Enzyme design. Structure first.
Site, PDB file in Angstrom:
ATOM      1  N   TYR A  16     -68.344  15.428  68.302  1.00 20.82           N
ATOM      2  CA  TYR A  16     -68.789  15.038  69.630  1.00 20.82           C
ATOM      3  C   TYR A  16     -69.021  16.221  70.526  1.00 20.82           C
ATOM      4  O   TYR A  16     -68.228  17.165  70.531  1.00 20.82           O
ATOM      5  CB  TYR A  16     -67.744  14.167  70.283  1.00 20.82           C
ATOM      6  CG  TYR A  16     -67.549  12.837  69.632  1.00 20.82           C
ATOM      7  CD1 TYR A  16     -68.341  11.748  69.994  1.00 20.82           C
ATOM      8  CD2 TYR A  16     -66.546  12.646  68.688  1.00 20.82           C
ATOM      9  CE1 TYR A  16     -68.138  10.496  69.435  1.00 20.82           C
ATOM     10  CE2 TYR A  16     -66.328  11.395  68.119  1.00 20.82           C
ATOM     11  CZ  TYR A  16     -67.132  10.319  68.498  1.00 20.82           C
ATOM     12  OH  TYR A  16     -66.947   9.060  67.950  1.00 20.82           O
ATOM     13  N   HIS A  66     -72.728   0.929  68.668  1.00 19.97           N
ATOM     14  CA  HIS A  66     -73.417   1.428  67.489  1.00 19.97           C
ATOM     15  C   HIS A  66     -73.504   0.466  66.296  1.00 19.97           C
ATOM     16  O   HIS A  66     -72.502  -0.038  65.798  1.00 19.97           O
ATOM     17  CB  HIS A  66     -72.759   2.748  67.144  1.00 19.97           C
ATOM     18  CG  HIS A  66     -73.349   3.533  66.001  1.00 19.97           C
ATOM     19  ND1 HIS A  66     -72.787   4.714  65.551  1.00 19.97           N
ATOM     20  CD2 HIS A  66     -74.463   3.353  65.256  1.00 19.97           C
ATOM     21  CE1 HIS A  66     -73.530   5.224  64.592  1.00 19.97           C
ATOM     22  NE2 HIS A  66     -74.563   4.423  64.382  1.00 19.97           N
ATOM     23  N   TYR A  68     -59.104  20.229  67.920  1.00 22.58           N
ATOM     24  CA  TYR A  68     -60.125  20.303  66.885  1.00 22.58           C
ATOM     25  C   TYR A  68     -61.461  20.863  67.345  1.00 22.58           C
ATOM     26  O   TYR A  68     -62.471  20.656  66.685  1.00 22.58           O
ATOM     27  CB  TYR A  68     -60.305  18.927  66.281  1.00 22.58           C
ATOM     28  CG  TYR A  68     -59.035  18.452  65.646  1.00 22.58           C
ATOM     29  CD1 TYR A  68     -58.606  18.981  64.435  1.00 22.58           C
ATOM     30  CD2 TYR A  68     -58.242  17.493  66.266  1.00 22.58           C
ATOM     31  CE1 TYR A  68     -57.408  18.568  63.852  1.00 22.58           C
ATOM     32  CE2 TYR A  68     -57.045  17.074  65.695  1.00 22.58           C
ATOM     33  CZ  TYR A  68     -56.640  17.617  64.488  1.00 22.58           C
ATOM     34  OH  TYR A  68     -55.459  17.220  63.918  1.00 22.58           O
ATOM     35  N   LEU A 110     -55.853  14.391  69.951  1.00 27.52           N
ATOM     36  CA  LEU A 110     -55.968  15.555  70.823  1.00 27.52           C
ATOM     37  C   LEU A 110     -57.288  16.256  70.562  1.00 27.52           C
ATOM     38  O   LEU A 110     -57.395  17.114  69.689  1.00 27.52           O
ATOM     39  CB  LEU A 110     -54.825  16.561  70.625  1.00 27.52           C
ATOM     40  CG  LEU A 110     -53.370  16.097  70.591  1.00 27.52           C
ATOM     41  CD1 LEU A 110     -52.507  17.346  70.655  1.00 27.52           C
ATOM     42  CD2 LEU A 110     -53.046  15.140  71.748  1.00 27.52           C
ATOM     43  N   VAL A 111     -58.273  15.914  71.375  1.00 31.41           N
ATOM     44  CA  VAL A 111     -59.612  16.461  71.285  1.00 31.41           C
ATOM     45  C   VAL A 111     -59.714  17.992  71.286  1.00 31.41           C
ATOM     46  O   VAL A 111     -60.316  18.565  70.374  1.00 31.41           O
ATOM     47  CB  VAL A 111     -60.502  15.804  72.383  1.00 31.41           C
ATOM     48  CG1 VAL A 111     -61.493  16.777  72.956  1.00 31.41           C
ATOM     49  CG2 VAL A 111     -61.196  14.598  71.809  1.00 31.41           C
ATOM     50  N   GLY A 112     -59.112  18.657  72.269  1.00 30.13           N
ATOM     51  CA  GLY A 112     -59.202  20.109  72.331  1.00 30.13           C
ATOM     52  C   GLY A 112     -58.640  20.898  71.154  1.00 30.13           C
ATOM     53  O   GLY A 112     -58.951  22.078  70.960  1.00 30.13           O
ATOM     54  N   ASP A 150     -59.405   9.272  70.029  1.00 33.82           N
ATOM     55  CA  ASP A 150     -59.665  10.695  69.863  1.00 33.82           C
ATOM     56  C   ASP A 150     -58.892  11.614  70.797  1.00 33.82           C
ATOM     57  O   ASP A 150     -58.390  12.655  70.379  1.00 33.82           O
ATOM     58  CB  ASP A 150     -61.166  10.962  69.958  1.00 33.82           C
ATOM     59  CG  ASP A 150     -61.961  10.251  68.860  1.00 33.82           C
ATOM     60  OD1 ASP A 150     -62.003   9.003  68.854  1.00 33.82           O
ATOM     61  OD2 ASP A 150     -62.553  10.942  68.003  1.00 33.82           O
ATOM     62  N   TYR A 185     -66.769  12.275  62.480  1.00 34.42           N
ATOM     63  CA  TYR A 185     -67.555  12.524  63.682  1.00 34.42           C
ATOM     64  C   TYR A 185     -67.355  13.813  64.454  1.00 34.42           C
ATOM     65  O   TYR A 185     -66.245  14.365  64.513  1.00 34.42           O
ATOM     66  CB  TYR A 185     -67.361  11.379  64.647  1.00 34.42           C
ATOM     67  CG  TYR A 185     -68.157  10.150  64.321  1.00 34.42           C
ATOM     68  CD1 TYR A 185     -69.533  10.229  64.098  1.00 34.42           C
ATOM     69  CD2 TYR A 185     -67.555   8.903  64.309  1.00 34.42           C
ATOM     70  CE1 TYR A 185     -70.295   9.089  63.881  1.00 34.42           C
ATOM     71  CE2 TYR A 185     -68.298   7.748  64.091  1.00 34.42           C
ATOM     72  CZ  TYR A 185     -69.671   7.849  63.881  1.00 34.42           C
ATOM     73  OH  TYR A 185     -70.427   6.712  63.678  1.00 34.42           O
TER      74      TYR A 185
END
Lengths: 620, 620
Positions: A376, A584, A299, A295-297, A290, A374
């Site tokens: 987060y 999970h 999205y 690149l998390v930031g 991710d 997902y």
């Protein structure tokens, strides 16, 4: 102003300007990543030299480049051409996800695959997943993505409810050709819908819920200056934001009397992997990085008042760069507010007759990111007593598959004929330590049991052991909940009034680490996930546990290589890397929309202060 | 009305009446314990037969008695004389704590001990601690307490700051004689004060804190009927209260559509031990059985609005019996309110364009108890998604000692010359399971790693193993955080729509259990603390992990004996006993008043429902 301030739209533009004027930002260049560099070690250098780092992709087929620019001086500082087949490909681009459904729609072998299943192509949605490094030698150097199909009965239908099993297709996004289409067999497509908005499924909405109103008639207790500097209950820090790491925290310090004591220099979630445990060739390659690949930031969601963040909220709207260098604003992408947190300290004394009670409070800095199925939540908490905590909240929709008729040892059934493969959500926190300065060391503390006898009589005594980690080669540690293992980060040159080193203790949740077999592709590429704690000597170029170019890289690039340097970490400028996550095994209660599950860690003062730091809190 | 309703003042009086009329409550009898019995297994018997259990102490020296009374019929059902030297002594009495300072004040060897330390007897406070079973053979059958001295410079001074080391004295409270006075040596008495109310120590109080106002303009979402029955967001239960166990929860059930599903029959913290790790003869005998010996609910605090419980609070004022049988009301001793708990579920879908967000809420039922130096918070949480959680909050003032000059391996230094011995706070939760009825079983679930090869290729697969616990002799389990060990309680005769047994999963914190050497006195007496989970077949007389008479009992009485019956637990009426706690190596930040630290566990639905149970929550 402050060299840690958020990148402005103006600066993003200046970078586009400087890149353009220097012939680096042609009509065919695409910015895969762009973010400010942190000031250099040596805050003695006066004068702002606001630099940026840019990963430039090339759509015609030319080698990508890593460019460093100085918006202050208006010049390009360095520019290197990258050999992706060696150091790894660049992060995936938003515009590339849309190509995989379009390309395959006109592919003969894909259409034949869908025909055998009586599926209409206008209803088949393809999920563009990152591709690891596996058998296929023809992918080396080429920028690949893999697709998995989901049927969407209508425009507002949750396609996740209808996975198309037995089908995968690899696609070269740059030359725009479908390299493979693998069809292992036809699996019935789960027909039950999963629309959590459909009144059929939801039933009549509850009317029993009464409002909970949370306000602050006099405003918050925290102040924001310089756009991102926070001052709250003796706490001091700067809220940064990077398109890769998301919210990043800088200069976390605590105001001890007439002294601003540093605790942490820089803190961020530097990587995040979501490995899948399904051995099936249709998903055995599935591993989301991710942070590294997507690149998390980038999205990040825009948070709403009353829905996502409730109370007296103060927002920050970070500025990202689109693929062409134009400033893009994530409105209300960062939530900030303080929360009541129950009782802080209480005692009713018989002898003195004094009844004492104090309430606790925590400050919250958060953002949410969506990545395919997902979503987060990233939460950072600062408490009155000096405790620092991090919490990841996992939600969204579970990735589905077909539940095999004979059952499965690696898949959960969520509805009739609908499966959900086993997976983990692993996080890696990068903690650039500055415990009362940069002379820090890490000691591993174990509880020690004593045999009944000499010192012991009655056999009631028990102790604690503390071994110092001196060289990087012995700084790779595993958890041990049985002996209560924790790690203390101290400063040997700073002492408290009892003449003992000031410190902070790290409490991990002790969840399992990476379960994948040691020799697997994902083990090599995400070696950081195989151990709970890593400590390394600080260096400017050592930023991520997986390295700088995670996409399609073969492994070893991050921590395993930094650690081989075997540098002295006893009383130096150190960096702590904590691995934590969730295993999970999806349950029925997770379908059709997954309720929030959490993981995290916390750091508490260990002889940092001379006495309790909350003695001066009043009684409201 | 309801056979689970709180004991009224009227009923307490009727018991005093019935005991008096039957010649059991003479002028010399003292009630050491009194509490209602739970209805019998077989809710088929119509008609209330409200019974009580009473432990009657005798001050002249006569054997105590265990009496059962039926307030409904106005008769005494049974009365047995107890041989305390065999089955253990009764709980300590409030009126007995005050005798230990008075007796020793006129004791020649005590006064001589204080003279050698130049300590004025009018300033020496003695802490009446329970006495375990150790070397001293003359204590058997006699009701003993042990004292430890603390100097109080003035009436409002915190005596905990001034421990008198090297001095202990045992006292027989019934015959009122001091049996021993042991003086191992003179230790300097720590002089620094520890008054967290003194503006010298606190400094100027912060003025930076702005109010956080939490209200509910339309009142709470929960209803209370019959004095203690709660109905909240599909949840149903009865809040009971016992003077020994404190808050107890009954008939926890969830309203699944047109069906009230039972989950837990009865839940309570049935025992709590605080062992000390100091090998010194002055404290090596120190072990508080807060629930067993002191009776937690007896020392419950009255909670204040805005200080202890903030928001829209609904109180319950339980009724206890004093030592003479008179009703005593603990006003506002139970807090109840609902709390906002962030995001419950969220997803922004690309394909459907639907953005979904729902807030979570938890209901809180709590009470606080003070026992000497420590204050403990007991919190029970019920969440919208069916999760049940328990949390213990430890606070108050740490028990102090003198910090030896040469340092110590079992004591922490908190100020100059002031120590604090190592200890644990261990809890034991009794969970009478009723997962969709009384036919339950417990399976231990371990994560299982797979070797790369046959099924695996790529080596990414990982699974889960589940072994059923069938006989009580194999139901004694240890935790294992490395493999993610958890325990599922299911009902084999109740299945979900996927034709799988409904269940609930138990998540433990995996903290260390009892560290004391296996052969020690405390190990035998608190055997329950040596293992994380115990499962036993239900029986009316098997109520506590340590047995019915914990005070000065020698060991083995609770779980180790129940478990030896080796009863079938596969699909029966079972009881789960979970051991959890904190290992405390006091730090400077804990002095002079300790900030809240926490432990707990939670239970989450594991295929209990047919799909997510929160699909019908609205969007406020």
């Amino acid at each position: 102003a402050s060299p840690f301030r958020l990148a402005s739209a103006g600066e993003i533009s200046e970078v586009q300007g400087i890149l353009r004027t220097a012939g680096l930002l042609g009509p065919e260049k695409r910015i895969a990543y762009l973010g400010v560099l942190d000031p250099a070690r040596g805050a003695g250098s006066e004068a702002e030299d606001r630099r940026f780092r840019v990963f430039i992709h090339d759509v015609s087929g030319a080698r990508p480049q890593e460019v460093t620019v100085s918006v202050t001086n208006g010049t390009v500082i360095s520019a290197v051409e990258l050999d992706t087949a060696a150091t790894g490909e660049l992060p995936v681009l938003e515009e590339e996800f849309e190509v995989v459904e379009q390309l395959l729609a006109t592919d003969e072998r894909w259409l034949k695959a869908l025909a055998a299943r009586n599926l209409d192509v206008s209803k088949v949605r393809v999920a563009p997943l990152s591709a690891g490094v596996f058998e296929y030698a023809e992918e080396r150097g080429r920028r690949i993505l893999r697709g998995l199909a989901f049927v969407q009965d209508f425009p507002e239908d949750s396609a996740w409810a209808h996975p198309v099993d037995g089908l995968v297709a690899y696609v070269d996004v740059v030359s725009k050709e479908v390299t493979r289409v693998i069809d292992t067999g036809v699996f019935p497509v789960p027909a039950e819908h999963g629309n959590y908005t459909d009144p059929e499924l939801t039933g009549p909405l509850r009317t029993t819920q009464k409002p909970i109103s949370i306000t602050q008639p006099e405003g918050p207790s925290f102040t924001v200056t310089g756009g991102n500097h926070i001052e709250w209950e003796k706490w001091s820090l700067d809220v940064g934001f990077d398109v890769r790491e998301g919210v990043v925290l800088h200069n976390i310090a605590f105001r001890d009397g007439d002294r601003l004591r540093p605790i942490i220099n820089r803190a961020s979630i530097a990587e995040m992997v979501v490995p899948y445990g399904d051995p099936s060739p249709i998903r055995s390659w599935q591993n989301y990085f991710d942070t590294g690949e997507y690149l998390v930031g980038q999205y990040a969601n825009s948070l709403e008042l009353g829905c996502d963040c409730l109370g007296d909220i103060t927002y920050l709207s970070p500025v990202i760069s689109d693929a062409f260098g134009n400033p893009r604003e994530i409105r209300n992408g960062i939530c900030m507010h303080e929360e009541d947190w129950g009782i802080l300290a209480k005692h009713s004394d018989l002898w003195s007759g004094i009844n004492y009670t104090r309430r606790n409070r925590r400050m919250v800095i958060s953002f949410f990111t969506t990545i395919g199925n997902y979503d987060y939540g990233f939460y950072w908490y600062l408490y009155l007593d000096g405790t620092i905590e991090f919490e990841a909240k996992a939600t969204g929709v579970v990735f589905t598959s077909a539940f095999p008729e004979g059952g499965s040892d690696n898949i959960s059934q969520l509805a009739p004929g609908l499966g959900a493969p086993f997976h983990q959500h692993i996080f890696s926190a990068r903690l650039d330590m500055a415990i009362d300065g940069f002379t820090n060391r890490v000691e591993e503390e174990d509880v020690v049991r004593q045999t009944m006898g000499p010192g012991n009589e009655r056999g009631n005594a028990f102790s604690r052991k503390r071994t110092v980690l001196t060289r990087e080669s012995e700084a790779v540690r595993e958890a041990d909940a049985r002996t209560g293992r924790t790690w203390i980060i101290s400063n040997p040159e700073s002492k408290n009034r009892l003449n003992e080193p000031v410190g902070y203790k790290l409490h991990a949740h002790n969840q399992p680490t990476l379960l994948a077999d040691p020799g697997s592709s994902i083990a090599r590429r995400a070696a950081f996930a195989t151990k709970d704690l890593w400590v390394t000597r600080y260096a400017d170029d050592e930023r991520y546990p997986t390295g700088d170019f995670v996409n399609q890289h073969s492994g070893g690039a991050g921590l395993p290589s930094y650690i081989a340097q075997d540098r002295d970490i006893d009383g130096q400028d150190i960096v702590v890397w904590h691995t934590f996550g969730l295993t999970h095994f999806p349950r029925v209660e997770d379908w059709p929309i997954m309720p929030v599950d959490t993981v995290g860690f916390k750091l508490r003062p260990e002889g940092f202060f001379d006495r309790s730091p909350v003695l001066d809190v009043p009684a409201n």
